[PDB]
Amino acid sequence: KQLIEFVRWSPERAQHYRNKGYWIDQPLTRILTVGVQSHPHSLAIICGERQLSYIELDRLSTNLATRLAEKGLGKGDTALVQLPNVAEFYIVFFALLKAGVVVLNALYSHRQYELNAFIKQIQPKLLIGSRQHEVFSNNQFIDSLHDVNLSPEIILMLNHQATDFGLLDWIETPAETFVDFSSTPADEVAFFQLSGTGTPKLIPRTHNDYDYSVRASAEICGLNSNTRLLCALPAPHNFMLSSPGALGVLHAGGCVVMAPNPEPLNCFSIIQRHQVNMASLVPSAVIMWLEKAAQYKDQIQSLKLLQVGGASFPESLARQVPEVLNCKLQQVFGMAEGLVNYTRLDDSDEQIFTTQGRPISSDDEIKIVDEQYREVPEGEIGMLATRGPYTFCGYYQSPEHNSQVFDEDNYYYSGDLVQRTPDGNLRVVGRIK
Numbered sequence: 001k002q003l004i005e006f007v008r009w010s011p012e013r014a015q016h017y018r019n020k021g022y023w024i025d026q027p028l029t030r031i032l033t034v035g036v037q038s039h040p041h042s043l044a045i046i047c048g049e050r051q052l053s054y055i056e057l058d059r060l061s062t063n064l065a066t067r068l069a070e071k072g073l074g075k076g077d078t079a080l081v082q083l084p085n086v087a088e089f090y091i092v093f094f095a096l097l098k099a100g101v102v103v104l105n106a107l108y109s110h111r112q113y114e115l116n117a118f119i120k121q122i123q124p125k126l127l128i129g130s131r132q133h134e135v136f137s138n139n140q141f142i143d144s145l146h147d148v149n150l151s152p153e154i155i156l157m158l159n160h161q162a163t164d165f166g167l168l169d170w171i172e173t174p175a176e177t178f179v180d181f182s183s184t185p186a187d188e189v190a191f192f193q194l195s196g197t198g199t200p201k202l203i204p205r206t207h208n209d210y211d212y213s214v215r216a217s218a219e220i221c222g223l224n225s226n227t228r229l230l231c232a233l234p235a236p237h238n239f240m241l242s243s244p245g246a247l248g249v250l251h252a253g254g255c256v257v258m259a260p261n262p263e264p265l266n267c268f269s270i271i272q273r274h275q276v277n278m279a280s281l282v283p284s285a286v287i288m289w290l291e292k293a294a295q296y297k298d299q300i301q302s303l304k305l306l307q308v309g310g311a312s313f314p315e316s317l318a319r320q321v322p323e324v325l326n327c328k329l330q331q332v333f334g335m336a337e338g339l340v341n342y343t344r345l346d347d348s349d350e351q352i353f354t355t356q357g358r359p360i361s362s363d364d365e366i367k368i369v370d371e372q373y374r375e376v377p378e379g380e381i382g383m384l385a386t387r388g389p390y391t392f393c394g395y396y397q398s399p400e401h402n403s404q405v406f407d408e409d410n411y412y413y414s415g416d417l418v419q420r421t422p423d424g425n426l427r428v429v430g431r432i433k
């Protein structure tokens with residue numbers, strides 16, 4: 001009956017973050033509950049031909065939660081989920097949040113090796129995947145787990161075979177018998193994020209810290225109930241999920257519009273069809289869009305805001321976003337470990353085109369340090385160290401690595417090389433291995 005173990009914030013910091021109104025001690029399911037009360041029939045998710053309202057998202061995720069609870073899956077248990085960019089990803093995410101099951105969302109691009117590693121670490125009693133994924137093409141992988149005593153109690157499959165438990169069947173109808181269930185407490189783990197050598201590391205995220213980053217991001221990006229956000233990046237990625245991502249849009253009462261990937265022609269027609277007004281991309285995908293955008297200018301006119309995060313996004317490329325994609329640019333530099341930086345919507349051109357913005361929170365603390373861990377003079381390049389109301393305090397079950405990436409004041413060293421501009425924004429300059 002024990003809850004998942006994780007490294008806590010110091011009580012003085014926890015109190016401060018409550019005093020500031022950052023941590024409001026609500027489960028992530030708050031996003032749905034509130035949406036259902038205010039606008040139950042407005043669209044929450046558009047996926048291909050499907051239109052899921054707020055109340056449908058709520059009903060369906062409740063259905064699945066009741067069936068997991070009926071099977072004795074709840075607080076103290078974990079789940080591994082691997083689904084593509086479809087509405088069922090969010091139905092499942094909210095169901096597990098409701099049931100108090102700590103979920104790890106694998107990327108759909110992850111393979112047997114990553115999945116095996118994730119299973120050993122969290123020992124999930126629930127596994128949800130797709131029969132269309134290579135790893136679940138046959139039963140070779142599933143059988144291998146019995147051999148090592150790592151078989152989950154329940155396996156659900158999207159695109160199921162006749163002898164599978166069908167994910168859609170566990171979603172469409174509630175359980176026959178009532179068993180009590182609830183979310184994990186708000187200052188306890190809700191789910192595992194993944195770091196971005198070796199398999200990704202597990203980042204425990206609490207309801208308090210994740211909800212805060214979501215609510216605060218939604219305000220920064222000016223989301224509202226008319227927001228239609230394209231979800232073309234992997235749905236589980238911190239960027240696509242929380243920055244402000246699908247959760248941010250749901251928090252603001254808007255609609256998520258799914259796309260399987262960032263391929264421009266398909267994305268452009270989805271943008272046109274649903275009048276998408278916001279999208280989020282990495283630089284390699286921005287380039288692809290730029291190459292087709294002149295010719296398909298008509299299809300993408302409705303875009304009002306494009307977020308770009310990730311690799312290297314030089315000024316000359318950034319300036320092409322408003323020029324060619326005919327929308328405002330926002331640069332985003334974040335990490336699944338916590339800290340996210342945004343250029344603001346009212347920042348100057350120079351800030352927007354040449355920087356990766358500034359932190360969500362006035363209580364995001366940042367040190368920029370040299371090789372001897374001394375704070376560099378203002379404006380100079382150094383290694384980023386950070387802590388704040390939504391930055392984690394250690395990887396899951398990883399005390400040795402944690403000791404190497406945190407200092408005594410619990411600052412996290414991300415490996416990023418940055419400099420603070422005279423205007424107050426960060427410029428990401430490189431990485432230390």
Ligand SMILES: O=C(O)c1cc(-c2ccccc2)nc2c1cnn2Cc1ccncc1
Pocket residue numbers: 196233234237238239240243282308309310311332333334335336340
């Ligand atoms: O440092 C990076 O390499 C990086 C990769 C990706 C990314 C996002 C989706 C898919 C693939 C890569 N996104 C990035 C990266 C840096 N900032 N961002 C935006 C971001 C925002 C929030 N949380 C995490 C990342």
Ligand SMILES: [Ca+2]
Pocket residue numbers: 050051052053056
């Ligand atoms: Ca519907």
Ligand SMILES: [Ca+2]
Pocket residue numbers: 300301302303304325326327
């Ligand atoms: Ca536009």
Ligand SMILES: [Ca+2]
Pocket residue numbers: 322323324325326
């Ligand atoms: Ca133009």
